[PDB]
Ligand binder design. Structure first.
Ligand SMILES: CC1(N)CCN(c2cnc3c(-c4cccc(Cl)c4F)n[nH]c3n2)CC1
Length: 496
């Protein structure tokens, strides 16, 4: 559901909300890459700070998580794991639900009848809908739907007054809902039937984020007004509760030590399964990594630990990957982000059954290139060249101020990968493998669409991210990475 996130309440409104409308164990989360988890306990309201600079959600006194939903799901089940300074347990028990419609994909606020009609007729299909502020009746709202099978009369647009009376919503009779969302959800599952038989099915929200890449710069300007980026990004975040897929294998005891961050885990249904492991290891099939198929494929993975370097090379070898993309230093802010899993220049190392040679390095302004030779010990004819592209200039926090270095780096990576016939997925990793990694992967996906079809194509940044987030938890972590994605695709379009 994710109703426990309130996008625009002050901390004072949060406290009054838990004290008057909550009970002990009630909780919510709120913004202002800073977030707060506000929890009621012994008739008092504690606030816990959550930080995200780009890599993961860091909860004070708790753990690191891929998404707020996964964070809230974890503590609602594990329990005893959220303590304070004293050391008494803070139990998250009851979501305090938000009523705002600001982060719903279908809520368009200020918007006239004919405006909605022009949008629903140029971008909608049968079942497309939206909700908007009633102009004629200040305070009320309007559900606009399209139904039908052009100008063949086979389609139509229907409006439906939503009255708002004493903070509750209704459509003229029947039940009175505590929120526009509860009303939409109800009439999505129990569609409204017109007199003459037409069924007003709320099938999908009118899409507003798909743009023609040629008009990219116009949308970045429209989104930079008052900020629109934040509105669009937090609406995507609202959809993260649909991606709580199982991550059981990463939770097994044998696999625990193979995870850089305890709770940042690969989805079972897209994880990379490693075969050909020796029988003496009870579980030899596990690495913290997921296949990302756009819909060139990718593998998104964490930075190596000393005890997974061998597994990382079994993955590279098994998947036939020929390009690796590193977007972290080994160490940053004094903290290990990825052990050196490659040999020094000219040297030759064995990593278990795998043997790697660093043939030559090449330094560029923003990145170093390492030409590596990977083979299985025992059969020399298995040798293949793996090209490691090590971006080194990514800031410790946030994103770069100009996308130019990243784009130039990514163009190189693309050309090398395109030059090797039958190359496997491109391996992309940072520290946790979801923020910088997701950002790089989504930029590459978008730009590939544009390199093949030119500037005269459609691209949809939030929908692409959602597709990628359904294959690895929390891909693209922050609003600043989001804005960077837009700004990088704007910059790439204008170099053409
Ligand atoms: C004013 C608003 N409340 C209404 C419309 N609008 C949108 C609309 N659609 C999306 C999306 C999205 C697109 C595709 C798939 C998924 Cl899963 C998404 F989540 N992300 N962000 C969005 N913002 C701006 C805010």
């Amino acid at each position: 559901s994710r109703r426990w996130f309130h996008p625009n309440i002050t901390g004072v409104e949060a406290e009054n909300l838990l004290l008057t409308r909550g009970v002990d164990g009630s909780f919510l989360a709120r913004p202002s890459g800073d977030f707060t988890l506000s929890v009621r306990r012994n008739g008092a309201v504690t606030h816990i700070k959550i930080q995200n600079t780009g890599d993961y959600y860091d909860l004070y006194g708790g753990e690191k998580f891929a998404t707020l939903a996964e964070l809230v799901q974890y503590y609602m089940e594990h329990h005893g794991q959220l303590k304070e300074k004293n050391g008494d347990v803070i139990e998250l028990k009851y979501p305090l639900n938000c009523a705002d419609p600001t982060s719903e994909r279908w809520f368009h606020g200020h918007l006239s009848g004919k405006e909605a009609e022009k949008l629903l007729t140029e971008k909608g299909k049968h079942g497309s809908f939206l909700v908007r502020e009633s102009q004629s009746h200040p305070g009320d709202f309007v559900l606009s739907v399209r139904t039908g099978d052009s100008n063949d009369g086979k389609s139509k647009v229907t409006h439906v007054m939503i009255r708002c009376q004493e903070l509750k919503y209704d459509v003229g009779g029947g039940e009175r809902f505590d929120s526009l969302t509860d009303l939409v959800e109800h009439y999505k599952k129990n569609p409204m039937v017109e007199t003459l038989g037409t069924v007003l099915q709320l099938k999908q929200p009118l899409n507003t984020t798909r743009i023609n890449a040629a008009e990219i710069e116009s949308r970045v300007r429209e989104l930079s007004k008052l900020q629109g980026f934040w509105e669009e990004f937090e609406t995507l975040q609202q959809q993260e509760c649909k991606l709580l897929y199982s991550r059981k294998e990463g939770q097994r005891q044998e696999n625990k030590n193979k995870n850089r961050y305890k709770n940042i885990l690969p989805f079972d249904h897209t994880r990379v399964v490693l075969h050909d492991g020796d029988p003496n290891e009870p579980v030899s099939d596990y690495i913290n990594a997921n296949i990302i198929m756009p819909e060139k494929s990718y593998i998104a993975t964490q930075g190596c630990l000393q005890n997974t370097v061998n597994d990382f090379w079994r993955m590279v070898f098994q998947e036939n990957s020929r390009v690796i993309v590193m977007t972290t230093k080994e160490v940053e802010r004094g903290k290990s982000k990825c052990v050196k899993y490659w040999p020094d220049e000219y040297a030759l190392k064995e990593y278990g059954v795998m043997r790697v040679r660093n043939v030559k390095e090449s330094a560029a302004h923003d990145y170093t290139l390492r030409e590596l030779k990977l083979s299985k010990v025992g059969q020399g004819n298995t040798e293949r060249t793996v090209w490691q592209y090590h971006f080194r200039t990514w800031p410790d926090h946030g994103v770069p101020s100009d996308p130019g270095g990243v784009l130039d780096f990514l163009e190189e990576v693309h050309h090398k990968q395109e030059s090797i016939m039958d190359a496997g997925p491109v391996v992309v990793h940072c520290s946790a493998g979801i923020g910088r990694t997701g950002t790089f992967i989504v930029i590459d996906i978008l730009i590939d669409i544009i390199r093949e079809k030119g500037v005269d194509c459609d691209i949809d940044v939030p929908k692409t991210i959602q597709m990628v987030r359904s294959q690895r938890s929390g891909m693209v972590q922050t609003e600043a990475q989001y804005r960077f994605i837009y700004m990088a695709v704007q910059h790439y379009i204008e170099t053409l």
